[PDB]
Design a protein around this ligand. Sequence first.
Ligand SMILES: CCCC[C@]1(C(=O)O)C[C@H]1[C@H](N)C(=O)O
Ligand SMILES: CCCC[C@]1(C(=O)O)C[C@H]1[C@H](N)C(=O)O
Lengths: 278, 279
Amino acid sequence: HLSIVTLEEAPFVIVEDIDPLTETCVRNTVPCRKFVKINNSTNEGMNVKKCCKGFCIDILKKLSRTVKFTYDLYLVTNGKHGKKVNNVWNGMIGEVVYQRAVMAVGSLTINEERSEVVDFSVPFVETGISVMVSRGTQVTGLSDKKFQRPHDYSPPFRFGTVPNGSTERNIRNNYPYMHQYMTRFNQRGVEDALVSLKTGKLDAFIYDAAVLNYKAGRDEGCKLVTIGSGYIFATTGYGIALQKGSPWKRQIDLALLQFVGDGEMEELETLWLTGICH
Amino acid sequence: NHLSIVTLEEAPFVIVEDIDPLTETCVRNTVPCRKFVKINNSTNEGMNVKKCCKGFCIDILKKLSRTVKFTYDLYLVTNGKHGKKVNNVWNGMIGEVVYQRAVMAVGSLTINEERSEVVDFSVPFVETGISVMVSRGTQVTGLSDKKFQRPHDYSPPFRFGTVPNGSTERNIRNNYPYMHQYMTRFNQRGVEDALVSLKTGKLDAFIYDAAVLNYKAGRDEGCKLVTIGSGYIFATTGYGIALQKGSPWKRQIDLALLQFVGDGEMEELETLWLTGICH
Ligand SMILES: CCCC[C@]1(C(=O)O)C[C@H]1[C@H](N)C(=O)O
Ligand SMILES: CCCC[C@]1(C(=O)O)C[C@H]1[C@H](N)C(=O)O
């Protein structure tokens, strides 16, 4: 009944293929589909069915047992989390804004531009802006002199983020020089940034706090250290996105508070999010 | 001289001391702040007494009125503390802004959704939430530990409480009625009282604001206290400068705070006032 959109980002949402011999998503996974175009000219395409698992998938399973709803999970195709591009929202935010999905689940950072057009769950994952450097690099945060005067260092201090998300907006809306310097170090994905950090091609990676803490926690060899931005103005959390004025915000929040109360949340946190390093 | 600003005493964010009587002056890192004290406990008759104010949020106020270039009149709230709707009327610092007795409210003021329906808030400059403090040695995973869920399963019953009428009590009473009703018998009148009961073994856990508990555990004489996050992620927020609803000054106050965070002035205040020595 309920159309729910998600986005793949480990460890919160992990996407794998279905076994063709089964027609089944098994173990801890649930069925999720994707509308994939036939080529790069039309929008013509068809659904391909996949399997989805992760921390927020397990939250969705708990939510639809407790609130007692059935759902059809699908993966966003136009954009990622959410950005206003040419005055139209893309990503998961757009799917809720334009009422193609009743809910959006995943590593969706609650911010203030987004909550002008969608209603939000209570935060269930603490997040913000964090800085990750190679183990050995010493930075106090985003206010360090390597981030404010990068040309004082040889080579110039190399740091960047993943564009079009919650982190870039917080930098672009408040510190224009920092943002303009960063875009030449735009990192396409989390995995690319960690490779350049450990190989010495990047000095610092600015990104979401929850993702960076998880990646540093179970990194092969414990080579990555994460420190808070110090941008306390950007502290927030992941939230389930609902349509503006949604009648389900009340019951979705009540179920999440139950999980936080009875320990289901902390037990989910030690299944997916705990780390080993530091 | 122009802007009336209300604050509330809570170390290390606001520390209140008396004026030197030979001078009538506030010197060093302190600024003049006044208090309206009643003459007795019968009428509302009273007079203003002048005091000196210092701390982390006082130093934020000094930077804001240098950068934005305003002069201010600092006074200490007398009816209530931070802010609560009592008999459908707001008291404390929130009430002073709601009823237009103060243009701004500065201090350990936690941003929540009930407060921001009647006042506007700066961007957060101190991240806070709900935290649990126990004696070093007590093992709790958070507020969802079964010592909190089922306190009567232990002998004696698990003794934990908070300070009433604040952000923490509202977050618990609005969502977990049994936990709140059990806590009120362990209501702590102040932070200092709760730390004494923890170190003497008369209280098992102290739920309170995260920033204050992290500071108190950081500078405890002997490092006797351990702080752990609530796990109540729904209650994560921060301290904010309270302004009247639709205030034209929220924009300029935010721009100055964002400048301090950008140029390192904030990190200089945080390691002068808030960093600790214990772990
Ligand atoms: C655009 C890919 C990465 C963007 C993210 C960021 O900018 O931090 C991670 C997203 C964040 N959780 C959000 O919801 O915008
Ligand atoms: C009135 C007792 C103080 C309780 C507080 C809390 O609830 O944690 C500390 C307050 C908090 N900073 C707020 O703004 O309410």
